[PDB]
Amino acid sequence: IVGGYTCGANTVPYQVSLNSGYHFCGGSLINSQWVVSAAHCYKSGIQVRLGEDNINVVEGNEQFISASKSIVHPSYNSETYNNDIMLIKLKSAASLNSRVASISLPTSCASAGTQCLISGWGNTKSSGTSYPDVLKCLKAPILSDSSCKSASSFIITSNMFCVGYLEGGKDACQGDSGGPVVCSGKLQGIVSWGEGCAQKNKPGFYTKVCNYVSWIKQTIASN
Ligand SMILES: N=C(N)c1cccc(-c2nocc2C(=O)Nc2ccc(-c3ccccc3S(N)(=O)=O)cc2)c1
Ligand SMILES: [Ca+2]
Ligand SMILES: [Cl-]
């Protein structure tokens, strides 16, 4: 997260860290045994880390649970970035508490102009590299489709939306991928891609979760 702030320990209790010997992506807990993340974060042997604040210190409140299934959307396309969503099933159900909590799936798509909360342990620099110990947060608005398209040098699909600030300085970044965008208490986005981070007229792009609610429910029910 570039140009954000320290969330505060466990203030985003649905935020998870995907770990393969180090933190590499975020995710969102949607029930006690399933996490929503990005298809492009797929790796085998993922450990999901719940209840984290400082990802480098055992503070208490952590639950580390291996992924038993990592289900990439069948229509994920790594060139076009369409359908950048993956569902991770936890080997065992997490013990839900105040610091480890699910986030609601949407019943309708979020409204253009709404200010949403993006979070993660990704790079905090727009140029160069600095990774935080503790969870970072950024509030930013959903931009119009027309604005997103005008900003982007890449083809935007109906399964993407953009959120951020066109003046630059405020964005998700590397290592935030797969983590949440929450709008009015609903998980509306997954950190997906952007042209660099926090550059002028290059806002962040996010998987549009409201398009996948039926798919998510069906896939969970059958697995
Ligand atoms: N600024 C962000 N919000 C953000 C979030 C996560 C990662 C990165 C990021 N940090 O460094 C690079 C990045 C990156 O995502 N690059 C990138 C650019 C374009 C595409 C893309 C989008 C749509 C269609 C096609 C493409 S592609 N795959 O042909 O380039 C994909 C990835 C930035
Ligand atoms: Ca920790
Ligand atoms: Cl820090």
Q: Please, what are the domains in the chain?
A: 1-12+103-210 (2.40.10.10), 13-102+211-223 (2.40.10.10)
**Amino acid sitting at position 184:** S
The DSSP letter of residue 107 is S
- 69 CA distance to ligand 1 middle (Å): 25
Q: Which two tokens stand for residue 127?
A: 């140029």
Note the Cα 49 to chain centre separation in Å. 14
Residue 58: closest CA among 6, 19, 109, 90: 19
Interatomic CA distance for residues 84 and 101, integer angstroms:
23
Write out the residues surrounding ion ligand 3, Cβ under 5 A. 132-134
The strand order across the sheet containing 160-163 reads: 5-6, 136-141, 115-120, 180-183, 186-193, 204-208, 160-163
CB 125 within 8 A of CB 4: no
Find tokens 């926090």 and name the residue. Answer: 198
Ligand nearest to the CA of 79: 1
Interatomic CA distance for residues 104 and 97, integer angstroms:
15
Residue 121: closest CA among 51, 174, 186: 174
Q: Which two tokens stand for residue 72?
A: 């990439």
Torsion angle in degrees (nearest 10) through CA of 27, 118, 103, 95: 50
Interatomic CA distance for residues 81 and 94, integer angstroms:
30
Active-site annotation holds for 177: yes
The count of other CB atoms within 10 Å of the CB of residue 119 is 26
Beta strands in 62-221, from DSSP E residues, in sequence order: 63-72, 86-90, 115-120, 136-141, 160-163, 180-183, 186-193, 204-208
Interatomic CA distance for residues 102 and 53, integer angstroms:
16
Q: How many CA atoms lie within 13 A of 215 on its CB side?
A: 15
CB 172 within 8 A of CB 191: yes
Pairing between β-strand 47-50 and β-strand 34-37 as defined by DSSP bridges: unpaired
Interatomic CA distance for residues 16 and 26, integer angstroms:
6
Find tokens 């039926």 and name the residue. Answer: 214
- 134 CA distance to ligand 2 middle (Å): 8
The technique by which this structure was obtained is: X-ray
Ligand nearest to the CA of 57: 2
Task: List 63's β-bridge partners, or say none.
Answer: 50
Q: Which two tokens stand for residue 23?
A: 């933190």
Residue 37: closest CA among 45, 138, 29: 29
CB 46 within 8 A of CB 71: no
CB 127 within 8 A of CB 104: no
Phi and psi torsions of 210, nearest 5° = -60, -25
Interatomic CA distance for residues 175 and 4, integer angstroms:
14
Interatomic CA distance for residues 47 and 32, integer angstroms:
15
Whole-Å CA distances, 133 to 5, 16, 118, 144, 198: 12, 14, 17, 33, 20
CB 90 within 8 A of CB 104: no
Residue 187: closest CA among 85, 52, 74, 46: 85
Pairing between β-strand 115-120 and β-strand 23-31 as defined by DSSP bridges: unpaired
Task: List 136's β-bridge partners, or say none.
Answer: 6, 120
193 lines ligand 1 (CB under 6 A): yes
Q: What is the resolution of this structure in A?
A: 1.6
Q: Which atom number of ligand 1 is nearest to the Cα of residue 205? A: 3
Among the listed residues 23, 28, 73, 84, the single catalytic one is: 84
